[PDB]
Structures are given as structure tokens and as C-alpha cells.
């Protein structure tokens, strides 16, 4: 059935290729350039026996093809594949330059070299006659920052080179020379040497294929895979400037702000833009539709008052913050010690990798620093209960955080914390009526023999930090809990100690054969004190009691009181945990 | 100059029969995918009231082979990308069809506008194969083993009861489509108006909602078109693809097919990214030749899953692949892989640093191979690698390819040598790189020298440095011996620093009161020569006041550089210069492997 075409065919036909405006810099590194050569050689090797067909880079995606509006005969707005075609040309400039310097005394420069040279002419130029003049254009033109220098490389008279991409090209060529001269020519006579290049020419003609896909617009091409060449950032840079046509001032402001955004690499740009939008709109917009939604909501004509110019600058500022918050780091200046909350932000996204919260936090950062502080803290507690302890589907977070994120964006410092609780509370009533699913889970928590034990550690740590408020006689309201919570201790999971009250590993003297069934149950587990008290304990309860004498951790009191630790005392702690778990992870 | 497209309707007007590949992944769209599917419909409906309503959705339905000569129905299509979009159209029409089950016999529109629109839309559900004697109408979309049972039932409006999370998603999708047409669209509309929009719905899926049908040559090829950067409704990964290829080799010994099939099943439990990442890091370990993401499918096929290796080892490897995948589940998130009974907390903290705090994923093939070595060899690698990464990436900024070969080769050597590997190899390996990229330590040295305190960050670079010289201080001081193995033996493991509670003090004060504000010194204030770590426990810094009124901080403390600082009379530009050199010197010694 299917129709495929070789790379030669792409250049055989009268095609001219050119990149989009805002085409990203060349990005092929040695990993790509080696693979490009080794692909060749596998197929040279296979030549001796079996087939060399390779479906290279299936898909050279083109966005328009004007036969009367071309650059020369058929313009192609290359959306994906530019690198490959670009380098292929580069590679052939190397084949031409190596060959041209071969000795070639007898019947080669006379014959075979010239026959090879006409067959690759097509990778460099396309001749066209108007009357008596043979005007001839180049077959591929790359990004604006690069093209000038690339062309230089193809003319084998390179320019100096002003940036990374220029260099990345220079190395690929350096590598190509080594690949032909050293790795393929090796030790061979000119006739043996041409024979192998004639096979390279023939590979690109017959064996190396792609699917040539034509498309109606840049956006449609782009939609085929929603980012070596174009991100949403580049498309928005373009759209956004195109909106500010008359005002040549607003443009330069915008171009600059986008360039600062586009510096950062593909994945992070797109992910930031998504998060930013989710905030602004208050909807869990899907990855593909981000490009579309940006234009419908944030960048449009009713919108289009050169507010867009302001918004672009707002995007940058958001990006500058996200570089802190995406890596778990505090967005505000360091003076306020604020270490305890700083420890939460790190926990929340470096340790538990709860990125969903991002638009929340971003919007939070545009509120007050106290707000940010409380939002981070609480949003942890939520995530812990909801997905560390319970295993709810993450879609719980999607819609919740988006409205919140939006709320906070409008309300800023007049945003009040209580909104967060009610918000969290709603959701938790719906999915957990009487704090009964949360409870059953906390109850069925087992210590892990291999983990860092995040889920148990999160639970203990947090109740401990909200212990004082647990034992305050009445009300225990969540807003009071947030005012009267312990921030003096910054718990490190790496140095946290999780004690087995009935010992983890007991020998014959310690016995209790059917207490062994009980160990690992949460009820047989306490957070030891990491305050200077040093937890070098392996023994039975009676022996190891000094561990709980008069220490900073709340539940240690009642653990001391026990003359012995039995099946029943395990049940008695389990419920104490399960209880405070509920009061401490509930919201009002 | 005109490019080809086709609508979802044209797709279905032809005599197509769409099916998924074997092992096609479970249905994965959630409320954000469907809330978009719907908002797409209404905007086009709102744009119908003025301008054009064209819209290129899921451009790129990609089939793998075609047969019309002899078909189950006329034309059969193996879908490798598109299924999920096409499936929630069949779903969404089934929902319109039950919403035209609202007004029975009602006023000359049933046989006119309801019987008609039923048949104009009949096409998404069944394709009438008239056949030799008996009419055989088949369903026009099939979606791989897990769902198809439950799915077929739902469109019919005779739903089964869910057994998987996927089953719920479709059930939610149905339920949300219900609500849309009745509450968003039909909301106070004369049923004449209502039919008018149901009708104008089909017209979009006829004329306005386009795609690009691509026909590929093989499944591999269809997948190659997705080699780079697509993330929604993944129907396959290298994992699923590899399961077929590996089964296809181990077929005529069912013993292997069952053990194989169940392992990949266990593997393929994990979400696709983790799967393709894990698969690469293992291949790298198995070859010692770090290989482009874009080539993992093939390099698995001509290396560890070839025909000359068709020795039933294949099934043992696939099992091994799963051993690794279990391990990688821990290491990947910085969590210790061994039985954590034997405390080893300090090294645990270094793994969490390396993977969760500094994010040096490049190391996974190395870390993985080491986990198959002694837990000692593991301990030491995580340690020494964190040293090398701090040096090369956090302080210096050598480009990440440096690591790519270095680790690939090391991971093999560790895989091959196992528990009788010796650390001095890892040091040598590291040491060769530094002899190459930084022969006389001058690059690393100046980078250290020009480290500045950050007004906003966590200061991870300066912290990585001061903690690490701090932790190796009794070795920096000893009557000099200078051996990397020596350092490793003598190294302090008694404190476990938490970046969140670690304190960086400016020796000349951060914000100095004018009475104490020397101006030449301010040009230095944030330079590392004026920065020191503080005893985490014990003393806590709160004070931005002058050196002299501030000397109590260093007196009899746990951290070595304090002794010298205590000994000063004043804190001059000259004393700064001196410290810089000390830090530069400590670094060069603590961060080398000779």
C-alpha cells in the first residue's frame, strides 16, 4: 500500500526547503552525528549480503507548497526534519570536499569523480533558466541566526562563528571528515574510495526513506505531535508580535521577553507555559490545546490592546519564579529565615514530586509570602493524606488546584487561607464521608524493608509537628492548628529514625513468636527523637525504654508509661495514630 | 499547493475496519481530554453562527497495514495512533443516539428527523456487510483486549460493570457527554432547536473536523514517527513492542512464552515514561555503549534479543530486565535498594542528594550496575559519583555528554565484574576525564573562586562544597598523605546535613549597619571568600552584625574551618583572600580521584 520516498527523491524533485521564522538553533550533538554515521555503516556492511533499507526519521513534515508562490519552484516550510536534511546537505558538502582533494591522476577526475559530482549537485543547488540566465538557489535554508554561517560551511569557506550552534555544526563536519577519511577510506586506493562513496550516494537515493507529509499550516504540522525546532513559546512569540503590527515599539519589548523565556530548554518552556495558563484560566487545560487556548483566551483582539505586551512580560516573571519552585526552591529573598516552610516546599516537590500543585504555588507566590508559606504547608498535608496515605487518582488535583490557582491570581494578598481549607474540605467530604477511607488506610500501613519509607515518615512527622494542638482540650479547629503548629524542628527523612517498639529483628531470647506477626504494623512503630538523643537501640521494650524518657516527641509519653508492650498496646497506638491522623489531615 | 486532509466522517463513510495492535495499552483519557473534546464542539457551534468552523483534530491517524482484497470486512486498518480519539467519537455519538431517545412519536419529527439522523449516524457503530446470504454488520472500531469487551457494551447502551480503572474513564466520558448535550446545549431549547444542533453536530464531523490519515509500512515504522515528543493517550511503548518481538522468538516453547508474557506484564504495569527510561538505562548497562533514545527499540533487537542468542536465555534476560525494573523503582526516586536494616543512613542521604536534590539521572545505568555489586561498592559509588557530579556540574558546568560515555562503559565493567569490582577503578575512570578536561585543576579552581552567594536560591552549589570539604576535614589536616582511597577511608560519616537547616553566614555582615560598613569589603560581601557553613546544631546564626561582635559563633564548634576563623583579630579583605584559597585548596583535594 504505502507511498514512501528516499532522501535523494526529496532533492531529485524541484523542492526548495526553508525553516520557519523563529526556528530554534541547530541542536544535533555527537550522539546524533555518530548515530548518523553508524546508520550509514550498518547499511554499508549489510550491503555485502542482505538489504540496507532504513526508515530514517520517517516523517519530513512540510506546511505549505506553493508551485507559483515558491522560493524557486516548490517552497517547503519545513516544520520537522530540518536538522536531518540540513546535516545531510552538510554531510554531502564533506563528501564533495574530500573527493575533490583525492589525488586522481588516471581516469577518475577524468571520469568517475565527475560522474559522482553531478549526482550530488542536487544537494547543493537547483538550477533554473529564465531566458539566457541560469539563476540557481540553495535547496535548504535554516534558521535566521544560523543560516549565514551554515551556508559558509557548505561553501567550504566557513565564517568565524558566533554561537554554540555554529560550533555544533563545525564539529559535525569535523566528525564527518574523520568518518570518511579515517573510518571508511581508512587504507584504500582512490578507486576503492570512490566505490564506497558511490554506494553512499546510492544509499541516500534508494535505501534511506522517509514519509513526506504535507500539511496546511504551521499549527497543523505542529499539532501532529502535540521540540527540537519549534515550541509553543516560538509560535506565541510569532503570534504575539503579529498582533502588535503597527506598534514597532511593543514588538521589541516582546521579542526580548520571549527570548529570555525561550533560552530555557524545550520540556521546561512548554511545561511552564501550561502551568501558567492553568493558573490564568482556572481550567486543567490539556497539553495539546495549550497553543490553541493561549490564542483564544490570553492573546486575542478584545484582549489585543497591547495588554498582550504586558502579559508577555508577566509570562517571563512567572517563568523566573518557576525556575525556583520547579526545583523545590524558595522564590522570595533569603533574609526571613523561614526554614521550616522552605523544608516543606523541598519535601513537596523534590521528595514527593507532586508537580500538580505548581499553578497553585505560582499563583500563591503572587499572593503574600505568609500565604505562600501556609499554602505550601497545607497543600502538602492534602497531598499526603490524598495520595501518600490514600491512593486516590491524581485527577482529584487537576480541577481543584486550577480554580484555586485562578482565585489566588485575582485575590492576591486579600486571598484568605480559609478558602483553601473549604476547597480541600469539599473535595474530601465527597470522596471520604466520615474520614473512613483515610482511616482504614492509615490503619493498614506497613513498614517497608527497602524504602526510605516516605508514607509512614510523612504521617508521623506531621502529627508530631501538630502535637501540641492535638492535646489542647477543646475545639482543635484547623485554623487554630495553623496558628499553633510546631515549626522549630526541620525533619530530615535521611536521619529520621523509625523505631520498631517490639524489635524489627529479634532472636531466641526475645521470642514472642506471634508478636512477630504484629511487627511492621503501624502500631508497632514510632518516630524516635532525632534531637540529640541518639538511637542506638536493638533490644526489647523493657531494655530500650530510655529511648522514650523525656523527649521532644508527643507520643513518647504514653510509650514510657507502659510496663510492657503487647498485642493490645499495638492496637492502642494504631488508634491514637488513626485518630490524630484524621484530626490533623482534616480541614475545619 | 493544496494539502490533503480527511474528516472523521469520510474516514467512516469508506468501508474501514479499525483495530489496535496486540498489547495496545488501556484507555487513558480523563476529564481534561473529554472536557476539551466537548469545548471543541461548542466553539465550532458558536463560530457556525458567524464565520467558518474548521478544526484539525488529532491530525495523524496512523495505520500500519491495509487489506481490501480479503477482509474481515471490506477494508481493514491496524491503528497505531488515533484509536483513543476515534473511540471517544463512537462513544460520543452513542450518547447523542440515546439523547434522541427522548421524544417518542413526537409531532411529525420521528420518522422525519430522528429516524433519519439515526441512519445518517448509524455508520460509527456498525458497517453493514451484506455478504453471501446473511447481512453481517460489524463494529467499526476495536480497542485491544482489556477494554473492548466493556467498551462494545457501553456504546450499545447495555453497559457491563467496570473491573479496571480504564472502565471508569469511559463510563465518566459517557456520563459527561450526557450532561453536555442536555444541560449545556439543549438547556431551554424547543426540541426543534435541539434536533437543529444535533444535526449541525454531524455536519462538523463531516466537513469541519479533519485529520491526516497516514499509512505506514510496518508497526516499527508507525512507531518511528512517534520517536520524538508526543504525550497523550499512548497506545504503545518500546516495552509492549519488545514483548511481541521476544515472544515471537520464544513461541514453540510455551514454558518461556508464559514466564516471558507475565514479566513484561509486570514491567508494563509502570507508566510509559518510566518504562522507556528504565529500558534505555538497562540497555546502556548491558552494552556499555550509551545509545540514543531514538535507537533503543533496534539496539535491543540486534544485541540482547537476537536470533544467534535464541537460546532460551532470552526468557532469563526478560526476567532480569524485571529484576532491574524493580531496583530502578527505588534508585530512580533516590530510595535505597538494599534491605535497609543495616542502617547506612549517611550513604542513603547521598543517594537522595544525588537523585532527588541534584537530579543526576545520567548516573542510573551506573547506580543500577552497582546495586548488583556489593552494598559496599554501592555505598562508595553513590558517594564518589556525588563528588564527581558536584565538581563537574554544580560548580563547573561541563556539558552533560561527558557523563554519557563515562557511565555507559563503567556500568558495563561493573555489570561484568560484579561484587569483585574495586573502587579504585571508578576513581581511575573519573580521574581520566579530569586529566582530559581539566588537567591541572585550573578550570575547577577558578569556578570555585568565583562562586557567589545567592540572594534567592537554596545555594546548592556553595552548600555542596562546604559540606563536602567539612566532611573530609580530618583528612585535609592530617600529616599529608594525599590518596583518594585514603580520603575515602578517613572520611567523616557521623553527621547527616540537611540543606534546609544548613546555615551560610557572611563573615563581614550581610547587611551591615552604616557604623560598621566598610565599602571595599562590600564589593566582596557575597563572594565565597566571605562565606562559611555554621554548626547545624548548637549555634544558630540570626545576626547581621560585625565580625568582632560576632566571634562567639566559631569558638569550639564541630566544623574545622572555624578554628582558623576564630583565630583572626579582624576580618579584612586580606583574610577573605586567604579563605578563598583554602576553599580552593580543599576543593581540589576533596574533589579529585588520583
Residue numbers in the entry:
A (entry chain B): 4 to 229, 235 to 596
B (entry chain A): 3 to 596
From the paper:
In PT-based Dnd defense systems, DndABCDE serves as the modification component to catalyze double-stranded DNA PT modification at the 5′-GPSAAC-3′/5′-GPSTTC-3′ sites (PS, phosphate-sulfur linkage), while DndFGH utilizes sequence-specific PT modification as the recognition tag to discriminate against and eliminate invasive foreign DNA lacking PT modification. Although it has been confirmed that iscS-dndBCDE and dndFGH form an antiphage defense system, in this study, we found that a dndI gene, situated within the dndFGHI operon, also constitutes a PT-based antiphage defense system along with the iscS-dndBCDE module. Sequence analysis reveals that DndI comprises an N-terminal DUF262 and a C-terminal DUF1524 His-Asn-His (HNH) nuclease domain, similar to the domain organization in SspE. Upon sensing PT modifications at 5′-GPSAAC-3′/5′-GPSTTC-3′, the ATPase activity of DndI is stimulated, which subsequently triggers a conformational transition, facilitating the dissociation of DndI from self-DNA, thereby allowing DndI to avoid cleaving self-DNA while restricting PT-deficient phage DNA.
